[PDB]
Amino acid sequence: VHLTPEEKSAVTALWGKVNVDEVGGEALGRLLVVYPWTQRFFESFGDLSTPDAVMGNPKVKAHGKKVLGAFSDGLAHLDNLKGTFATLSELHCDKLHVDPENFRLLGNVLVCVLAHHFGKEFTPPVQAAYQKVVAGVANALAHKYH
Amino acid sequence: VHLTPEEKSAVTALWGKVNVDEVGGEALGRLLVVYPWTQRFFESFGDLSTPDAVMGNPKVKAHGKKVLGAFSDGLAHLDNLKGTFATLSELHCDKLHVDPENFRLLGNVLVCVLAHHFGKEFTPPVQAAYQKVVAGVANALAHKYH
Amino acid sequence: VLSPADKTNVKAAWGKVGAHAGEYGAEALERMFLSFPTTKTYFPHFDLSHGSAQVKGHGKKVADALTNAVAHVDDMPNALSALSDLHAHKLRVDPVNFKLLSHCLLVTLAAHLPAEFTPAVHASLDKFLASVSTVLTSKYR
Amino acid sequence: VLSPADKTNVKAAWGKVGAHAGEYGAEALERMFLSFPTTKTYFPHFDLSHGSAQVKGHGKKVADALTNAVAHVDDMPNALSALSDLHAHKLRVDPVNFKLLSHCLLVTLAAHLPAEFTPAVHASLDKFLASVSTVLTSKYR
Numbered sequence A, B: 001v002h003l004t005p006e007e008k009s010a011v012t013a014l015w016g017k018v019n020v021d022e023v024g025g026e027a028l029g030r031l032l033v034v035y036p037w038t039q040r041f042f043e044s045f046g047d048l049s050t051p052d053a054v055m056g057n058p059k060v061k062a063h064g065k066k067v068l069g070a071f072s073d074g075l076a077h078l079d080n081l082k083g084t085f086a087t088l089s090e091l092h093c094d095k096l097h098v099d100p101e102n103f104r105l106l107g108n109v110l111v112c113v114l115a116h117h118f119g120k121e122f123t124p125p126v127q128a129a130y131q132k133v134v135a136g137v138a139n140a141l142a143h144k145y146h
Numbered sequence C, D: 001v002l003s004p005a006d007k008t009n010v011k012a013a014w015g016k017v018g019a020h021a022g023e024y025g026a027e028a029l030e031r032m033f034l035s036f037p038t039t040k041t042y043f044p045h046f047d048l049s050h051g052s053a054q055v056k057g058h059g060k061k062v063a064d065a066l067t068n069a070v071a072h073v074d075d076m077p078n079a080l081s082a083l084s085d086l087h088a089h090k091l092r093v094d095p096v097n098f099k100l101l102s103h104c105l106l107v108t109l110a111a112h113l114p115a116e117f118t119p120a121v122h123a124s125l126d127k128f129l130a131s132v133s134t135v136l137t138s139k140y141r
């Protein structure tokens, strides 16, 4: 995705402060609480019946770390999210059957979690840069759908 | 955009049967009838109080023809819609203030009008190929928005 | 909200569909899978080849449910209760997909009802499919 | 549909927003104009510069209407009727833009309510804003 030196610089410095283990865990649990229909892809994950249950579930936490660890990789390849995410795109279409619309919801919940965690430092312009990156990543992941 | 040779010949073949002026006025008029909010840019066209008044307004019909002649000329450059529509994108954003969502609505109302006009000849594969073309057009027109 | 005229328009276009409701339903599904492939992600267990019995039976179920909403347009939440619990609690289809099927349905009616698909009927049908999508979506969370 | 727990969450979250409601409404618009630049096509008459008094006064009107929405959570349609008529027949903002502002308001709330923006509160806040959006676009057609 095309970001300005200022956006890139925003995105990078902020992510240097993200503990992926914890944010991925919060991102994925809030996704499952806020838009429960996404729980369809995680039936074998435990009790996802209350916010508390979803949040403390270790499998949700372990997955969220995987998901944002992969997401972290794309940030370092912000110039070619397509080739970076092409194998996972195919994975999610052909084996996981994930409606790519979920990648957008996750991207928005992630922006929320970054706002909640960083508060005041997650300013309007910072948000803007992250908004283009999650839209970038979602598209890159929906790219091999057919 | 991403069209196979067969999709291109399906789009261009049916398009050769199109009375650009008639469909143009029809697609714009249906746009203004089915999604009345889009009438917001056309207060100077006059009477848009009924469906019959919209469809029959010579000013909608003349706008319809202009819009669809530009789309029609766009179909000759399916390999480069961004370049074909870059200035129009610039106009629509900085001078006309047209929310790109409206291009998506017109592209779907256009597909409906070609299905009404062509009937059985507007088969699922043909729809699919026009759906890519009207999403490509909607994307190239929104590309210069800032 | 559906106007009194919207209801009359819908009952006139649907009445017209009559016995083809099922063939239209299957044609709309084929149109959605071909135009909007991500919707196939909801049917990994179906044979989605053209003419497949599964698509034809599903299309028939889709139309009947639509025929039922026409018949009970003045009280859809209750007429569609069951389907809305099914879509909300079991199938859990993301709500964006409903706009894609309602568009494909509209295209299928356009293609088949040349005489009846006037501007105002088009408008009323679009609103109706919107309300049907709302009702099917209303128990999601 | 808003559950009594959702109303409780919304009231508690909103109740904490208190007199900052305006400042947050302005921050929410700014986030919106910067993240989704298409929404600026509706305010070609405003100075959308950070700090703009026009965005502040408008943020303030948006916030107060949401304060009235909260105060009338079991009677929103009626409480928001003139705002619904205004966006439907004069302003005519494409429905798609109400979700972009609802996302920006949610982000502004997350950034200012570290302790109160729990997962459950985030979910009831989204629901509430989707319901506000539904009411304001209900008279479009």
Ligand code: HEM
Pocket: A038, A041, A042, A063, A066, A067, A068, A070, A071, A088, A092, A096, A098, A102, A103, A106, A107, A137, A138, A141
């Ligand atoms: C948008 C950013 C996303 C990224 C980078 C991502 C990345 C990943 C990775 C790396 C894996 C496999 C882990 C491994 O074997 O190494 C995976 C699996 C999976 N993903 Fe995604 N994912 C994303 C979004 C989503 C969304 C939003 C959903 C659905 C709500 C989803 C559903 C799943 C499922 C169901 C699996 C299989 C998990 C299992 O076997 O337990 N993913 N994803």
Ligand code: HEM
Pocket: B038, B039, B041, B042, B066, B067, B068, B070, B071, B088, B092, B096, B098, B102, B103, B106, B137, B141
């Ligand atoms: C395929 C989609 C579209 C194409 C190709 C397109 C093309 C055009 C063209 C070629 C013009 C005239 C440019 C000039 O003055 O030199 C124009 C103007 C205009 N367009 Fe678009 N347009 C499209 C969609 C829309 C939509 C959906 C709307 C809003 C509902 C819209 C609103 C306008 C307005 C208000 C003007 C100015 C007309 C005047 O000043 O009389 N356009 N468009």
Ligand code: HEM
Pocket: C039, C042, C043, C058, C061, C062, C065, C066, C083, C087, C091, C093, C097, C098, C099, C101, C102, C132, C133, C136
């Ligand atoms: C007009 C809106 C819709 C209506 C009236 C409708 C109606 C129905 C009905 C009547 C069934 C029950 C099937 C049975 O009992 O065999 C069903 C199931 C199903 N629907 Fe919907 N539906 C709609 C929207 C959607 C959308 C947008 C999708 C996804 C793209 C979706 C995906 C499903 C799935 C996957 C099934 C289960 C199929 C099976 O495994 O038999 N539906 N729908």
Ligand code: HEM
Pocket: D039, D042, D043, D058, D061, D062, D063, D065, D066, D083, D086, D087, D091, D093, D097, D098, D099, D101, D102, D132, D133, D136
């Ligand atoms: C949470 C949903 C919203 C609320 C509560 C809201 C509320 C309001 C209020 C209270 C007014 C001023 C009414 C008056 O005092 O005359 C207004 C005006 C307006 N709204 Fe909304 N609004 C919402 C969403 C939107 C959206 C998403 C847009 C477009 C992105 C939009 C565009 C405008 C514009 C252009 C004006 C007039 C600005 C001016 O010229 O003064 N509104 N809105």
Ligand SMILES: [O]
Pocket: C062
């Ligand atoms: O369905």
Ligand SMILES: [O]
Pocket: D062
């Ligand atoms: O607004």
